[PDB]
Amino acid sequence: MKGDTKVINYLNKLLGNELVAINQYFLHARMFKNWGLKRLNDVEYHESIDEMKHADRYIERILFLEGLPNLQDLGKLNIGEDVEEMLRSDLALELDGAKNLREAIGYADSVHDYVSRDMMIEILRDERGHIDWLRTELDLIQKMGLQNYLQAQIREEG
Amino acid sequence: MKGDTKVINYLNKLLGNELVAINQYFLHARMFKNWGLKRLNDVEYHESIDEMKHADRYIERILFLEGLPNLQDLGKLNIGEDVEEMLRSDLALELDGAKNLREAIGYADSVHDYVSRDMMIEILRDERGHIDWLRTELDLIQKMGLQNYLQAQIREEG
Ligand code: HEM
Ligand SMILES: [Zn+2]
Ligand SMILES: [Zn+2]
């Protein structure tokens, strides 16, 4: 059974944001790791994996609705040059994606595709966990300054 | 500290091949899944994951060598429309990567970057296992014909 075409188009757009997030978070994670920031690697690596899981959900749903998942067109990665920039870029990506997601949810609701709607709602809740974490780290960077924040990362992980 | 420039360029090219393989194999896998081909999904899915592991190896090595991993440029996916096309496309990709690997291995060796050389040798051994499996499966589809091959798969499954 062919799904709603605009629903599939939304799912592909959202998948597109996840593909950027997977790569951006994975590269940021390994950058953190290479800098010896073990906590940040662990957090960022698991964020990347969670985005992979999201992408998989999108791919499965699109195929079920007889659409064609687009894994070809990779959007712009915004790789930061220091830890503050990297986290700010992650936050910007999450917020952009979240707005897209809320609009998509509304649309799926409007055409009674409740299964797609609810899948996207679960995903939204996940992204909001990451947004909450990011805002906390960034607040601490603001308060401490990046260099003291980084010293504390290393010292507190031990 | 900083690695050989050409080694890093090879590692980035090779990483590029892995990024295509990740997406191509993942989509192929979920296509198999959606078609109720559980065994084909399982093999293709784990191939995708192994290519992810390969990419991680490249990313970490590049960073250690103080290069910039390229996760932005994604090469051409060649997504098949039936099981035979899809598997043959996977083989083409692997064979192309395999030749790239062999060149890079010889080159890393020549500048005494044995860590990169041996990493690539291990990855190549993995790629060659996939090539082996692909040839045998393609042989079966040729022998049976794709219509009867697919009927066998579902007879045997569930
Ligand atoms: C730069 C690209 C990617 C990299 C480097 C990468 C890397 C990884 C790694 C390291 C793992 C963990 C494997 C292990 O446990 O040893 C993983 C798991 C996984 N990946 Fe990816 N991945 C990438 C892209 C993708 C994409 C695009 C998708 C889907 C569209 C995807 C789907 C998955 C899934 C479903 C898992 C298993 C999650 C779980 O159940 O634990 N990956 N990936
Ligand atoms: Zn997500
Ligand atoms: Zn590989």
Short mmCIF file of C-alpha atoms and ligand atoms in Angstrom, two decimals:
data_model
loop_
_atom_site.label_atom_id
_atom_site.label_comp_id
_atom_site.label_asym_id
_atom_site.label_seq_id
_atom_site.Cartn_x
_atom_site.Cartn_y
_atom_site.Cartn_z
CA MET A 1 0.00 0.00 0.00
CA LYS A 2 1.51 3.30 -1.17
CA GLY A 3 1.82 5.86 1.64
CA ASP A 4 0.92 9.53 1.50
CA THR A 5 3.45 11.14 -0.85
CA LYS A 6 4.02 14.21 1.31
CA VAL A 7 4.52 11.92 4.35
CA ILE A 8 7.21 9.97 2.49
CA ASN A 9 8.80 13.25 1.38
CA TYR A 10 8.91 14.44 5.02
CA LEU A 11 10.44 11.11 6.13
CA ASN A 12 13.15 11.46 3.46
CA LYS A 13 13.85 15.04 4.50
CA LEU A 14 14.13 13.94 8.13
CA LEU A 15 16.33 10.96 7.15
CA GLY A 16 18.54 13.52 5.39
CA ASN A 17 19.05 15.42 8.68
CA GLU A 18 19.87 12.10 10.42
CA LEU A 19 22.50 11.24 7.82
CA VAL A 20 24.23 14.59 8.48
CA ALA A 21 23.94 14.05 12.23
CA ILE A 22 25.41 10.52 12.04
CA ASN A 23 28.50 11.73 10.22
CA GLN A 24 28.89 15.01 12.11
CA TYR A 25 28.55 13.33 15.52
CA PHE A 26 30.78 10.41 14.56
CA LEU A 27 33.58 12.69 13.37
CA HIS A 28 33.18 15.03 16.38
CA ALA A 29 33.33 11.94 18.66
CA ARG A 30 36.58 10.64 17.18
CA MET A 31 38.04 14.18 17.28
CA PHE A 32 37.19 14.32 21.00
CA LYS A 33 38.77 10.85 21.42
CA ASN A 34 41.92 11.90 19.57
CA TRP A 35 42.15 14.95 21.87
CA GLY A 36 41.91 12.63 24.93
CA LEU A 37 38.41 13.79 25.94
CA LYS A 38 37.02 10.40 26.96
CA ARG A 39 33.68 11.52 28.38
CA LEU A 40 32.84 13.64 25.33
CA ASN A 41 33.83 10.83 22.95
CA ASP A 42 31.59 8.42 24.84
CA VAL A 43 28.62 10.80 24.82
CA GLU A 44 29.10 11.89 21.19
CA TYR A 45 29.74 8.32 19.92
CA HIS A 46 26.47 7.12 21.49
CA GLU A 47 24.63 10.10 20.05
CA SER A 48 25.91 9.07 16.60
CA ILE A 49 24.73 5.47 17.18
CA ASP A 50 21.30 6.71 18.30
CA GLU A 51 21.02 8.75 15.08
CA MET A 52 21.91 5.59 13.12
CA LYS A 53 18.99 3.86 14.86
CA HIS A 54 16.72 6.77 13.96
CA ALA A 55 17.86 6.62 10.33
CA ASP A 56 17.09 2.88 10.30
CA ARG A 57 13.54 3.63 11.55
CA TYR A 58 13.06 6.17 8.77
CA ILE A 59 14.45 3.80 6.11
CA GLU A 60 12.19 0.95 7.24
CA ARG A 61 9.07 3.16 7.31
CA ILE A 62 9.77 4.78 3.94
CA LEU A 63 10.22 1.35 2.29
CA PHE A 64 7.04 0.03 3.92
CA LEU A 65 5.11 2.99 2.47
CA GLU A 66 6.54 2.08 -1.00
CA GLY A 67 8.85 5.10 -1.10
CA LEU A 68 12.53 5.30 -2.03
CA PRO A 69 14.92 6.12 0.86
CA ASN A 70 17.49 8.71 -0.21
CA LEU A 71 20.91 7.80 1.19
CA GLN A 72 22.67 9.51 -1.74
CA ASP A 73 22.24 13.22 -1.04
CA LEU A 74 24.33 14.11 2.00
CA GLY A 75 23.71 17.61 3.37
CA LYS A 76 26.27 20.05 4.72
CA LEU A 77 28.28 18.88 7.71
CA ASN A 78 29.37 21.63 10.08
CA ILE A 79 32.48 20.29 11.73
CA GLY A 80 33.72 22.59 14.52
CA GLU A 81 37.39 23.56 15.02
CA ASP A 82 37.23 23.49 18.84
CA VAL A 83 35.04 21.78 21.41
CA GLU A 84 32.74 24.77 21.95
CA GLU A 85 32.14 25.21 18.20
CA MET A 86 31.52 21.47 17.78
CA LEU A 87 28.82 21.37 20.48
CA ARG A 88 27.19 24.60 19.23
CA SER A 89 27.07 23.09 15.72
CA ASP A 90 25.47 19.88 17.09
CA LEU A 91 22.89 22.04 18.90
CA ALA A 92 22.09 24.05 15.75
CA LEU A 93 21.60 20.82 13.80
CA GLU A 94 19.32 19.32 16.47
CA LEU A 95 17.15 22.43 16.69
CA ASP A 96 16.80 22.70 12.90
CA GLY A 97 15.87 19.00 12.76
CA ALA A 98 13.44 19.32 15.68
CA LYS A 99 11.46 22.10 13.97
CA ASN A 100 11.30 20.00 10.79
CA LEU A 101 10.19 17.02 12.92
CA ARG A 102 7.39 18.95 14.67
CA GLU A 103 6.06 20.15 11.30
CA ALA A 104 6.24 16.59 9.88
CA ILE A 105 4.38 15.17 12.90
CA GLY A 106 1.58 17.73 12.40
CA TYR A 107 1.30 16.79 8.76
CA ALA A 108 1.21 13.00 9.39
CA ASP A 109 -1.48 13.64 12.04
CA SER A 110 -3.51 15.68 9.52
CA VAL A 111 -3.65 12.74 7.05
CA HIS A 112 -4.24 10.10 9.74
CA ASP A 113 -0.85 8.39 9.34
CA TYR A 114 -0.69 7.76 13.07
CA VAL A 115 1.99 5.09 12.83
CA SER A 116 4.41 7.55 11.09
CA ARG A 117 3.29 10.31 13.48
CA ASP A 118 4.06 8.30 16.61
CA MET A 119 7.40 7.03 15.29
CA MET A 120 8.44 10.67 14.74
CA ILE A 121 7.14 11.61 18.21
CA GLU A 122 9.42 8.97 19.81
CA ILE A 123 12.33 10.26 17.77
CA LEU A 124 11.55 13.89 18.78
CA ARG A 125 11.69 12.90 22.45
CA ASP A 126 15.13 11.36 21.84
CA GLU A 127 16.47 14.47 20.09
CA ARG A 128 15.18 16.59 22.96
CA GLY A 129 17.32 14.57 25.41
CA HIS A 130 20.37 15.53 23.33
CA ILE A 131 19.28 19.18 23.12
CA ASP A 132 18.91 19.27 26.93
CA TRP A 133 22.42 17.77 27.43
CA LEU A 134 23.95 20.23 24.95
CA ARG A 135 22.40 23.28 26.56
CA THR A 136 23.83 22.15 29.92
CA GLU A 137 27.38 21.65 28.59
CA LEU A 138 27.29 24.91 26.68
CA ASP A 139 26.05 26.78 29.80
CA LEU A 140 29.03 25.37 31.70
CA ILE A 141 31.43 26.40 28.88
CA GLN A 142 29.93 29.92 29.08
CA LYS A 143 30.41 30.01 32.87
CA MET A 144 33.88 28.44 33.12
CA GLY A 145 35.42 29.36 29.81
CA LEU A 146 36.38 26.69 27.32
CA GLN A 147 39.88 26.04 28.61
CA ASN A 148 38.79 25.57 32.27
CA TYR A 149 35.89 23.41 31.01
CA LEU A 150 38.36 21.25 29.09
CA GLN A 151 40.77 20.96 32.05
CA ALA A 152 37.80 19.84 34.19
CA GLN A 153 36.73 17.26 31.56
CA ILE A 154 40.15 15.64 31.80
CA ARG A 155 40.58 16.04 35.56
CA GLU A 156 37.07 14.76 36.48
CA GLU A 157 37.15 11.73 34.19
CA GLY A 158 40.62 10.88 35.45
CA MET B 1 52.81 13.34 14.83
CA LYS B 2 51.93 14.19 11.19
CA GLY B 3 51.70 11.32 8.73
CA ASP B 4 52.70 10.95 5.11
CA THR B 5 50.46 13.22 3.00
CA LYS B 6 49.92 10.58 0.32
CA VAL B 7 49.14 7.88 2.93
CA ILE B 8 46.51 10.21 4.42
CA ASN B 9 45.10 10.85 0.92
CA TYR B 10 44.86 7.08 0.33
CA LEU B 11 43.18 6.55 3.68
CA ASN B 12 40.61 9.26 2.78
CA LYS B 13 39.92 7.69 -0.65
CA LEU B 14 39.51 4.30 0.99
CA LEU B 15 37.25 5.83 3.65
CA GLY B 16 35.18 7.25 0.77
CA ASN B 17 34.68 3.73 -0.62
CA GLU B 18 33.57 2.55 2.85
CA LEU B 19 31.02 5.42 3.15
CA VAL B 20 29.39 4.33 -0.12
CA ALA B 21 29.46 0.65 1.01
CA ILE B 22 27.85 1.51 4.37
CA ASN B 23 24.84 3.21 2.75
CA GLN B 24 24.55 0.86 -0.24
CA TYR B 25 24.63 -2.26 1.96
CA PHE B 26 22.30 -0.75 4.57
CA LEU B 27 19.60 0.19 2.04
CA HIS B 28 20.02 -3.15 0.20
CA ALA B 29 19.59 -4.96 3.58
CA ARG B 30 16.34 -3.16 4.45
CA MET B 31 15.09 -3.74 0.93
CA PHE B 32 15.67 -7.47 1.48
CA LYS B 33 13.94 -7.15 4.90
CA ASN B 34 10.88 -5.34 3.44
CA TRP B 35 10.62 -8.09 0.76
CA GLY B 36 10.51 -10.73 3.52
CA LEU B 37 13.96 -12.03 2.62
CA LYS B 38 15.21 -12.47 6.20
CA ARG B 39 18.44 -14.35 5.49
CA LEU B 40 19.53 -11.86 2.82
CA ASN B 41 18.72 -9.00 5.22
CA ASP B 42 20.86 -10.63 7.92
CA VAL B 43 23.93 -11.09 5.71
CA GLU B 44 23.69 -7.62 4.09
CA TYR B 45 22.96 -5.88 7.41
CA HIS B 46 26.07 -7.36 9.04
CA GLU B 47 28.14 -6.45 6.00
CA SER B 48 26.99 -2.82 6.42
CA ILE B 49 27.98 -2.91 10.13
CA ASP B 50 31.39 -4.35 9.29
CA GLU B 51 31.97 -1.51 6.79
CA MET B 52 31.03 0.93 9.55
CA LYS B 53 33.74 -0.68 11.68
CA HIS B 54 36.15 -0.30 8.74
CA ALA B 55 35.29 3.40 8.37
CA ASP B 56 35.92 3.92 12.10
CA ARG B 57 39.40 2.40 11.70
CA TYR B 58 40.15 4.80 8.82
CA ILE B 59 38.78 7.85 10.69
CA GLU B 60 40.84 7.17 13.82
CA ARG B 61 44.02 6.49 11.80
CA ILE B 62 43.63 9.69 9.76
CA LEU B 63 43.08 11.73 12.94
CA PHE B 64 46.05 10.13 14.67
CA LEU B 65 48.13 11.03 11.63
CA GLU B 66 46.80 14.64 11.93
CA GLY B 67 44.76 14.52 8.72
CA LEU B 68 41.16 15.58 8.15
CA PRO B 69 38.73 12.69 7.61
CA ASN B 70 36.37 13.44 4.75
CA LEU B 71 32.82 12.43 5.71
CA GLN B 72 31.28 15.13 3.50
CA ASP B 73 31.88 13.80 0.00
CA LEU B 74 29.77 10.76 -0.67
CA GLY B 75 30.41 8.84 -3.89
CA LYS B 76 27.86 7.25 -6.18
CA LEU B 77 25.58 4.66 -4.61
CA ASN B 78 24.51 2.01 -7.10
CA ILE B 79 21.28 0.65 -5.66
CA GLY B 80 19.90 -2.39 -7.51
CA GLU B 81 16.21 -3.01 -8.14
CA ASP B 82 16.26 -6.80 -7.69
CA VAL B 83 18.40 -9.21 -5.68
CA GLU B 84 20.75 -10.10 -8.53
CA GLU B 85 21.46 -6.45 -9.50
CA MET B 86 21.96 -5.48 -5.87
CA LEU B 87 24.44 -8.27 -5.16
CA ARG B 88 26.29 -7.65 -8.45
CA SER B 89 26.53 -3.94 -7.57
CA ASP B 90 27.99 -4.88 -4.15
CA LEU B 91 30.61 -7.04 -5.90
CA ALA B 92 31.65 -4.23 -8.29
CA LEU B 93 32.11 -1.90 -5.34
CA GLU B 94 34.17 -4.48 -3.42
CA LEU B 95 36.37 -5.35 -6.40
CA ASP B 96 37.04 -1.63 -7.01
CA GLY B 97 37.86 -1.06 -3.33
CA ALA B 98 40.10 -4.16 -3.28
CA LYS B 99 42.31 -2.77 -6.07
CA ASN B 100 42.46 0.61 -4.29
CA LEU B 101 43.46 -1.21 -1.07
CA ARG B 102 46.24 -3.21 -2.72
CA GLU B 103 47.77 0.01 -4.15
CA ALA B 104 47.55 1.83 -0.82
CA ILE B 105 49.09 -1.13 1.08
CA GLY B 106 52.14 -1.21 -1.19
CA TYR B 107 52.49 2.53 -0.88
CA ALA B 108 52.20 2.64 2.95
CA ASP B 109 54.78 -0.15 3.12
CA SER B 110 57.18 1.88 0.92
CA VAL B 111 57.28 4.83 3.38
CA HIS B 112 57.50 2.48 6.40
CA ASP B 113 53.99 3.27 7.71
CA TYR B 114 53.43 -0.28 8.86
CA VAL B 115 50.56 0.56 11.19
CA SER B 116 48.53 1.87 8.21
CA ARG B 117 49.78 -0.94 5.97
CA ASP B 118 48.71 -3.72 8.38
CA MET B 119 45.39 -2.04 9.15
CA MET B 120 44.66 -2.07 5.41
CA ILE B 121 45.79 -5.70 5.07
CA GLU B 122 43.26 -6.73 7.76
CA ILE B 123 40.47 -4.72 6.11
CA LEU B 124 41.34 -6.27 2.71
CA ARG B 125 41.03 -9.78 4.19
CA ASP B 126 37.54 -8.85 5.38
CA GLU B 127 36.59 -7.42 1.95
CA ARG B 128 37.76 -10.64 0.25
CA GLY B 129 35.42 -12.75 2.44
CA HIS B 130 32.46 -10.67 1.23
CA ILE B 131 33.63 -11.06 -2.37
CA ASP B 132 33.72 -14.87 -1.82
CA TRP B 133 30.15 -14.96 -0.47
CA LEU B 134 28.90 -12.68 -3.29
CA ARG B 135 30.33 -14.91 -6.06
CA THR B 136 28.74 -18.07 -4.60
CA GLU B 137 25.33 -16.39 -4.21
CA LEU B 138 25.45 -14.88 -7.71
CA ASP B 139 26.30 -18.36 -9.07
CA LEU B 140 23.19 -19.82 -7.35
CA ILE B 141 20.93 -17.04 -8.81
CA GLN B 142 22.40 -17.68 -12.26
CA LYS B 143 21.83 -21.44 -11.91
CA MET B 144 18.28 -21.10 -10.57
CA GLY B 145 17.16 -17.94 -12.34
CA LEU B 146 16.06 -15.04 -10.18
CA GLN B 147 12.31 -15.85 -10.16
CA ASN B 148 12.84 -19.43 -8.91
CA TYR B 149 15.65 -18.28 -6.57
CA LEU B 150 13.28 -15.90 -4.77
CA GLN B 151 10.57 -18.62 -4.57
CA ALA B 152 13.10 -20.98 -2.94
CA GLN B 153 14.08 -18.33 -0.36
CA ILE B 154 10.46 -17.86 0.83
CA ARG B 155 9.68 -21.61 0.64
CA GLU B 156 12.68 -22.17 2.92
CA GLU B 157 11.80 -19.25 5.25
CA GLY B 158 8.88 -19.06 7.72
C1 HEM C 1 29.99 7.53 8.88
C2 HEM C 1 29.00 6.63 8.72
C3 HEM C 1 28.74 5.55 9.80
C4 HEM C 1 29.60 5.08 10.70
C5 HEM C 1 31.10 5.45 10.89
C6 HEM C 1 28.92 4.09 11.49
C7 HEM C 1 29.47 3.39 12.53
C8 HEM C 1 28.81 2.48 13.31
C9 HEM C 1 29.40 1.74 14.40
C10 HEM C 1 30.86 1.86 14.87
C11 HEM C 1 28.45 0.96 14.92
C12 HEM C 1 28.63 -0.01 16.10
C13 HEM C 1 28.97 -1.41 15.60
C14 HEM C 1 29.49 -2.23 16.75
O1 HEM C 1 28.71 -2.46 17.71
O2 HEM C 1 30.68 -2.65 16.72
C15 HEM C 1 27.22 1.17 14.18
C16 HEM C 1 26.00 0.55 14.40
C17 HEM C 1 24.84 0.70 13.68
N1 HEM C 1 24.69 1.49 12.55
FE1 HEM C 1 26.16 2.76 11.77
N2 HEM C 1 27.62 4.00 11.05
C18 HEM C 1 27.47 4.88 10.00
C19 HEM C 1 26.31 5.10 9.29
C20 HEM C 1 25.11 4.45 9.46
C21 HEM C 1 23.91 4.72 8.72
C22 HEM C 1 23.81 5.81 7.63
C23 HEM C 1 22.95 3.90 9.17
C24 HEM C 1 21.49 3.83 8.69
C25 HEM C 1 21.04 4.59 7.70
C26 HEM C 1 23.53 3.07 10.21
C27 HEM C 1 22.90 2.08 10.94
C28 HEM C 1 23.38 1.42 12.04
C29 HEM C 1 22.59 0.55 12.88
C30 HEM C 1 21.09 0.19 12.71
C31 HEM C 1 23.57 0.07 13.97
C32 HEM C 1 23.26 -0.88 15.14
C33 HEM C 1 22.78 -0.06 16.33
C34 HEM C 1 22.56 -0.98 17.50
O3 HEM C 1 21.51 -1.68 17.50
O4 HEM C 1 23.43 -1.01 18.42
N3 HEM C 1 24.85 3.44 10.36
N4 HEM C 1 27.48 2.11 13.20
ZN ZN C 2 17.70 11.47 15.34
ZN ZN C 3 35.38 -2.30 4.31
#
